[PDB]
Amino acid sequence: SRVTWYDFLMED
Amino acid sequence: VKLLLLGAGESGKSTIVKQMKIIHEAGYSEEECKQYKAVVYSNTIQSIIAIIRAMGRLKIDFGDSARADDARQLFVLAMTAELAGVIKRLWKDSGVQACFNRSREYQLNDSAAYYLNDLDRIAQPNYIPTQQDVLRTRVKTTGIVETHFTFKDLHFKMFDVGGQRSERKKWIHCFEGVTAIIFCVALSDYDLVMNRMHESMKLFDSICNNKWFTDTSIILFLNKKDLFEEKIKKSPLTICYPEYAGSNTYEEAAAYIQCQFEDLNKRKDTKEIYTHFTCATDTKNVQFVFDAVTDVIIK
Ligand SMILES: Nc1nc2c(ncn2[C@@H]2O[C@H](COP(=O)(O)OP(=O)(O)O)[C@@H](O)[C@H]2O)c(=O)[nH]1
């Protein structure tokens, strides 16, 4: 349920 | 002004924050610097240790067999005169220097040489860390860091974001109302044994092309230009970009790297990238560049 900011933006 | 500071670990984020404190907040008093003495010693110690351990793996001999005993004593002893003596002699050895010159093959603090070459000053019983010493220190920043300051009638809220994981909710409050984003890149990472420079490009890519930053100023800080200029003299850019056909001058190589990052922008006609070449530890350079960044925010 926690993620880096990169994967957060890379979300579709 | 809500400012976001992003970039891979060790690209220079916390150092810039320190510069903001120095330039717009009253700087580092002599007593504040005294608090960094332990970190300076710790950084110095781990640096020389990293170089010696590398000598073993890379199979590099000392220039003088006598150093073998100093190396042994180093590990046992870890700032006493005793330890300083062991470090000065090891740092001076040609074999150790041989390994140091091959740092691109293992993990070594950027400031390694800075401290080791200044050991005499650092080792003194009444040593007091200078601002440059503090700026040079390496301490991993875990968790978001914030700093406030007023400049040209603007109240800045600067957030230094590392690489920790978090709930989507916290990221939302983090990335909202962002006036500008400064992405830091460690130019000197180009030849480090995917490519560290390419990891960085991947990061920048997601920032630059994200729809929700369409009205956010994207600023690119091509940092560590000073370390880069020194490395480019002996380590070719091809190690990082194998297709590169230019010369190995600081100027061409730097322009190329800049071009590689700016090319990632899929809306060149709509979105502009504000690129700067920086030396995060050089407060005079960070001041000049930040002044320029502030003007672009005013405009
Ligand atoms: N020579 C040099 N060292 C730098 C520069 N920018 C940062 N550093 C050093 O490299 C490391 C990056 O650290 P900091 O800024 O601590 O961490 P970051 O926020 O994770 O990237 C620190 O040891 C800094 O003192 C630069 O432009 N030149």
Architecture overview:
The complex is a heterodimer of chains A (12) and B (299). In chain A, 42% of the residues lie in helices and 17% in strands. Chain A is an alpha+beta fold and 12 residues long. With 299 residues, chain B is of the alpha/beta class. Chains A and B meet through strand 1 and helix 1 of A and strand 4, helix 10 and helix 11 of B. Strand 1 of chain A pairs antiparallel with strand 4 (166-167) of chain B, so a sheet runs across the interface. The complex binds guanosine-5'-diphosphate. Residues 9-15, 109-111, 135-136, 138, 141, 223-224, 226-227, 278-281 of chain B line the site of guanosine-5'-diphosphate. Guanosine-5'-diphosphate (GDP) binds next to helix 1, helix 9 and helix 12 of chain B.
Distance between the termini of chain A: 16 Å
- What share of residues are in beta strands of chain A? 15-25%
Basic shape of chain A: flat
- CATH level-two architecture of the largest domain in chain B: 3-Layer(aba) Sandwich
- The multimeric state of the shown protein is heterodimer
Please report the number of helical segments of chain A: 1
* Helix/strand class of chain A: alpha+beta
| Main β-sheet description of chain B | 6 strands, mixed
Question: Care to count the β-strands of chain B?
Answer: 7
- Give the fraction of residues assigned to helices of chain B: 40-55%
Region (G4 motif) (chain B): 219-226
Domain G-alpha (chain B): 1-299
Family (chain B): Belongs to the G-alpha family. G(i/o/t/z) subfamily.
Modified residues (Deamidated glutamine) (chain B): 164
